[PDB]
Write a protein that binds this DNA or RNA. Structure first.
Ligand SMILES: [K+]
Ligand SMILES: [K+]
Ligand SMILES: [K+]
Ligand SMILES: [K+]
Ligand SMILES: [K+]
Ligand SMILES: [K+]
Ligand SMILES: [Mg+2]
Ligand SMILES: [Mg+2]
Ligand SMILES: [Mg+2]
Ligand SMILES: [Mg+2]
Ligand SMILES: [Mg+2]
Ligand SMILES: [Mg+2]
Ligand SMILES: [Mg+2]
Ligand SMILES: [Mg+2]
Ligand SMILES: [Mg+2]
Ligand SMILES: [Mg+2]
Ligand SMILES: [Mg+2]
Ligand SMILES: [Mg+2]
Ligand SMILES: [Mg+2]
Ligand SMILES: [Mg+2]
Ligand SMILES: [Mg+2]
Lengths: 211, 115, 108, 51, 109
RNA sequence: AUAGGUUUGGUCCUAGCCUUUCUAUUAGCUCUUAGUAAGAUUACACAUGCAAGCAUCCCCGUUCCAGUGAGUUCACCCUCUAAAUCACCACGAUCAAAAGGGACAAGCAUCAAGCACGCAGCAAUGCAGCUCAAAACGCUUAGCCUAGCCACACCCCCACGGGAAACAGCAGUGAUUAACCUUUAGCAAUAAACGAAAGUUUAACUAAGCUAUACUAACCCCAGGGUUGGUCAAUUUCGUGCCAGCCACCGCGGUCACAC
């Protein structure tokens, strides 16, 4: 095979140039509030976000006004406050500000999540840090804000099989000599339907490429 | 052939002729063409009523279960078909569309009564 | 030949078919350069109406004009098909009547 | 909207349970094909016949 | 699962011994002629590792696939010498023979 | 091939060419209806309009589908093992890259030698070896083994870079060729992308338009084309006179020509 070395050189050069010309958060996640478009790409934001973009604050717009960038403070979100009655918040543990921003209002954060009053065991990266959806819990309100009594979370333990599948199961049992009259049942105790708005793993999320 | 990402899905491949559709239930890579390469044919579906006024659906239930257990996804029309067969629960959209049709026909009957 | 020799030589290898004056094409377009007449080889005697044409491929070739009476002149466009003129040696192309400038034979 | 959301949650729960059961059946069939008792008996019988 | 080499067990004649610890072996298979429907011999050359350099030109040897190729062309090892050239021992009777004649009679033992 | 015509003064043999059969493209002449299938000659150049969005901002997709056949043994089997789907707690299944082994188009040997193409050693280094008339090395031809697959995405194999400004997406156009479809509609179905979802988008697709290229069925009045010496079904009168002309092969035409 005749080697393709120019392809090797091109891939290596492009990798180096992408690693050295990384667009920063201050560039990627800036917004023109008059037209609600991203200057970096020119793509307009979805309609349903417009009002929030003009009313709410990004997470580090709050953190940059605090000592140590607000480590140990509690931060919640407007969407969580509207959607859920139980407390939802992040307890910050690590913050990496974007020094290139003029107001230090862009960057990354990590913390412990409590969703609907259930706290997690480990600290992980926070997603949607650049969203205009963030609010800071006052220190004199935290005791009232974090208060939560875990209600009995008793849901269905099992459900009926679909009609045809139930009939097939019963027919198989009867063919194999079993004469049991117990209904076939699907266990759903191991299926926990997590709410669609629960934070995902920001570590697995991608990043916009520089263009 | 190697596709970037992708997954197996059980779906309907359209065959037949103009004004006469027919569907082959096939498990295929989601990136493949609709009527192109497939992994296995898992059944068929004739959407036109026959001389007996019936829509004939053939389902290879054993292989359907096998491919679902192998990680294959399902297209929405297949979820509706399997719900109709009783293999799955009725899809929520069938129930919602039935309720919408009920409300629309109730509105029509109310119009008739008003007239 | 023995079976061993047949296995060694393998299946017969047929030479590729020879391309004719049309080079494997049904017809060819051409421009008439000059019109003239040629005499048959002699079991026969006549004055066969012929014309030299530059084909679309660039090659110059002699063609026969069938029918009684033709009005072909220089620089005119004609369509030529295959089929040898049995009487004329070296004339393997025939002008198509009723196409481009070459019109149909006048009645009677 | 609310009724549809609840219906989707329940339907997806049921479908996920069915999918896990199908996956378990597939894995069980693979295990019974490779290291199943009948397969092992057949292998031993074939070896004895060969000997 | 035990080897990445296609040919696992093969029998051939040693045709070369000029490489160090490597025997060049000729293996013949029967291939059907599609037209004549007769089986003809097809030859292939294999390089077999011979650590002790005990192979001689003309002897019939058995080659076993290596777990992985030890070289570009060496994918096999010498399992045994089926027939030593000019030193054949009759497998049926276990006695030395020269062609179709017994060098030592079976009855003698 | 159930074969047939044609070499000779004549017979037999050998041998070529052609005829009879079935397809596809184009050309001449002719052409009524309905349904269905199929549909630039050109890897030449392209005006114009569309062909990728979705979504509470992040991401995801635009790496797919669709197109072409320039190049061309990257496609298939086994081993190993990435990425992806589902288990997602992994045990592992499914799917499938890179790497290793095997297999794999046609013509030319007036392409007969290739010129480092091997092996052993932890390495240092040593041996001089390896392929090939059972076709190496080389030139030329071609997309293929079609539920589909391979290759390419203007060119320099590749694309950091350069030439330069790209329809081999749909519709359409110029040139070119014997070769010539509408600058329609809709996302109602299926498929794909996105979303938790109601849903949104899509020249994929669906439903239409044009065309005897093909198949099927008709038709109230409506038939054309070719042929008529033998092979091979079928000529009456005249005209012409080796001229005009005709033939797939054998051949006809010189005043009674079934051959113009
Ligand atoms: K004559
Ligand atoms: K998205
Ligand atoms: K090609
Ligand atoms: K190329
Ligand atoms: K649609
Ligand atoms: K006469
Ligand atoms: Mg003959
Ligand atoms: Mg004669
Ligand atoms: Mg025609
Ligand atoms: Mg993996
Ligand atoms: Mg591979
Ligand atoms: Mg020779
Ligand atoms: Mg020569
Ligand atoms: Mg080509
Ligand atoms: Mg182009
Ligand atoms: Mg290129
Ligand atoms: Mg086009
Ligand atoms: Mg055409
Ligand atoms: Mg449109
Ligand atoms: Mg159409
Ligand atoms: Mg006549």
């Amino acid at each position: 095979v005749r080697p393709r070395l120019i392809a090797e050189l091109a891939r290596r050069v492009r990798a180096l140039r992408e690693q050295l010309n990384r667009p920063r958060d201050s560039q990627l996640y800036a917004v023109d509030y008059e037209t609600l478009t991203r200057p970096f790409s020119g793509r307009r934001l979805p309609v349903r976000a417009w009002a929030d973009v003009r009313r709410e604050s990004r997470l580090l717009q709050l953190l940059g006004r605090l000592p140590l960038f607000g480590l140990g403070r509690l931060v919640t979100r407007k969407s969580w406050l509207w959607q859920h009655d139980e407390p939802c918040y992040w307890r910050l543990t690590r913050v990496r500000p974007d020094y290139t921003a003029q107001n230090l209002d862009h960057g990354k954060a990590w913390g412990i999540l409590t969703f609907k009053g259930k706290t997690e065991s480990e600290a992980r990266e926070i997603e949607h840090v650049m969203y205009h959806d963030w609010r800071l819990v006052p220190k004199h309100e935290e005791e009232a804000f974090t208060a939560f009594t875990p209600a009995p979370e008793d849901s269905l333990a099992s459900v009926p099989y679909p009609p045809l599948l139930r009939a097939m199961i019963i027919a198989e049992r009867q063919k194999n000599g079993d004469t049991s009259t117990e209904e076939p049942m699907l266990n759903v105790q191991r299926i926990r339907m997590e709410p669609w708005d629960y934070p995902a793993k920001q570590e697995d999320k991608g990043r916009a490429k520089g263009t | 052939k190697a596709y970037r990402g992708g997954h197996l899905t059980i779906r309907l491949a359209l065959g037949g002729c103009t004004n006469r559709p027919f569907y082959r239930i096939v498990a295929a890579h989601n990136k493949c063409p609709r009527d192109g390469r497939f992994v296995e044919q898992l059944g068929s579906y004739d959407p036109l009523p026959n001389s007996h006024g019936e829509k004939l659906v053939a389902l290879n239930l054993d292989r359907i279960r096998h491919w679902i257990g192998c990680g294959a996804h399902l297209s929405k029309p297949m979820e509706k078909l399997l719900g109709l067969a009783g293999f799955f629960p009725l899809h929520p959209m069938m129930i919602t569309n039935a309720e919408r049709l009920r409300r629309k026909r109730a509105r029509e009957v109310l119009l008739a009564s008003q007239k | 030949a023995t079976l061993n020799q047949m296995h060694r030589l393998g299946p017969p290898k047929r030479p590729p078919r020879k391309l004719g004056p049309t080079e494997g094409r049904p017809q060819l377009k051409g421009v008439v350069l000059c019109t003239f007449t040629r005499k048959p080889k002699k079991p026969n005697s006549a004055n066969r109406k012929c014309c030299r044409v530059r084909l679309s491929t660039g090659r110059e070739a002699v063609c026969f004009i069938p029918g009684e009476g033709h009005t072909l002149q220089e620089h005119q466009i004609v369509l030529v098909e295959g089929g040898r003129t049995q009487d004329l040696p070296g004339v393997k192309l025939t002008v198509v009547r009723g196409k481009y400038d070459c019109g149909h034979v006048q009645k009677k | 909207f609310f009724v549809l959301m609840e219906r989707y949650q329940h339907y997806r729960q049921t479908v996920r349970a069915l999918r896990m059961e199908f996956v378990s059946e597939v894995q069980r069939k693979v295990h019974e094909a490779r290291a199943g008792v009948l397969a092992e008996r057949k292998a031993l019988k074939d070896a004895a016949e060969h000997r | 699962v035990r080897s990445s080499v296609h040919a696992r067990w093969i029998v051939g004649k040693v045709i070369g011994t000029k490489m160090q610890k490597t025997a060049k072996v000729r293996v013949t298979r029967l291939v059907l002629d599609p037209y004549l429907l007769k089986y003809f011999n097809k030859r292939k050359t294999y390089f077999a590792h011979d650590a002790l350099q005990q192979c001689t030109v003309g002897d019939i040897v058995l080659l076993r696939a290596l777990p992985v190729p030890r070289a570009k062309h060496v994918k096999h090892e010498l399992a045994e010498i089926v027939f030593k050239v000019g030193k054949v021992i009759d497998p049926v009777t276990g006695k030395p023979c020269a062609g179709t004649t017994y060098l030592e009679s079976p009855l003698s033992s």
